[PDB]
Symmetry: C5
Subunit: 94 residues, 5 copies
């Protein structure tokens, strides 16, 4: 059931499917290790639709936060991180 991935500052995670589609519950975003003080923003693109901000993590202030989103899509979902430090996404499949 458990699911998780570290999305890195220049890299992107894509969630695709393979005729069946699983439903993923994204629960938590946690700031990764680093010394940089600038914030990291978690961003999401479904297809070509404009990107949506999921959360903002500020080192030593808001180091992790709840998301509780759910994904069961026919289009690929692209998570990206803008900022100096990676974001650990954790959750579970339904």
């Amino acid at each position: 059931a458990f699911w998780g991935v570290e999305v890195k500052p220049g890299k992107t995670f894509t969630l695709k499917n393979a005729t069946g589609i699983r439903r993923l519950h994204l629960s938590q975003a946690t700031l990764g290790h680093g010394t940089a003080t600038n914030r990291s923003i978690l961003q999401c693109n479904v297809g070509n639709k404009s990107p949506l901000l999921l959360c903002v993590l500020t080192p030593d202030k808001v180091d992790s936060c709840q998301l509780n989103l759910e994904f069961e899509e026919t289009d690929e979902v692209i998570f990206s991180v803008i900022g100096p430090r990676s974001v650990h996404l954790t959750g579970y499949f339904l």
Copy 2:
């Protein structure tokens, strides 16, 4: 299925349930900008008196959980009062 929209400052998003789904609103995140004044997320199902959903303060409370649910015949109008947009995210069912 995933759902989301960026509500710009001083603008309105309208949720229609015409052609019928139940939306779970999960998260509100402050958008990009340099302004330090707060943004308030507002909701009105009807021309009714608006109810406050949450307050986002730059560099203090940049996002917050909502966990509201909508399944209405009337339109639902979300609005943002403040200098920076609010990204609403959630999911159907």
Copy 3:
């Protein structure tokens, strides 16, 4: 499904299963805190949350009610509290 009410400082609201999701501090310039209180019948009052202006302006509750008994929400403090949630 959506449900909500603004409980004014000097006022009480009286209430199948309602999921109370969110409490948000209302407009005003007062800096004193507001406390959300709940009286279910002759029972002693229980505190649901505390909102402090410019510090804790809203918070999750995630409570549920379906009560043959009358539920009375009240706010002690200078500013109103917007309660939001949903049925079922």
Copy 4:
């Protein structure tokens, strides 16, 4: 469905009705500035810490049954209002 109890700074609460969902802990009335800790009982586990004028309430979202040990205690100067609902 609604459920709640004020656990006083020096008193223990036990559950004695359905599958209980503990949702919220709120600091009770008082002027004391010292922290209050909510504890559960076997070595006891901390559920949350509430600090006056800093963290006055917080989410829990745990599930209990009377079949369980279920011994809640509060260590600190101010009581803790536990609120939630039965399943």
Copy 5:
């Protein structure tokens, strides 16, 4: 239903399913101590690379919601990096 364990600093707790239940991890609370450095909750499944679950900072963020669920064939290794323990609480099913 209730479940919980204190993961001591630098130590490991193992969630083992065999003989199979679904555990809902709800809450992480910082344990007793005077150290001001942060504690990080970490999760491994088998020999894969560890994922960060949450960060607890003394006197700032002393506890936080997790709402993770586990129902795996392999052991789950929780670990704490930092000076103070982390009390994990949750429930089965």
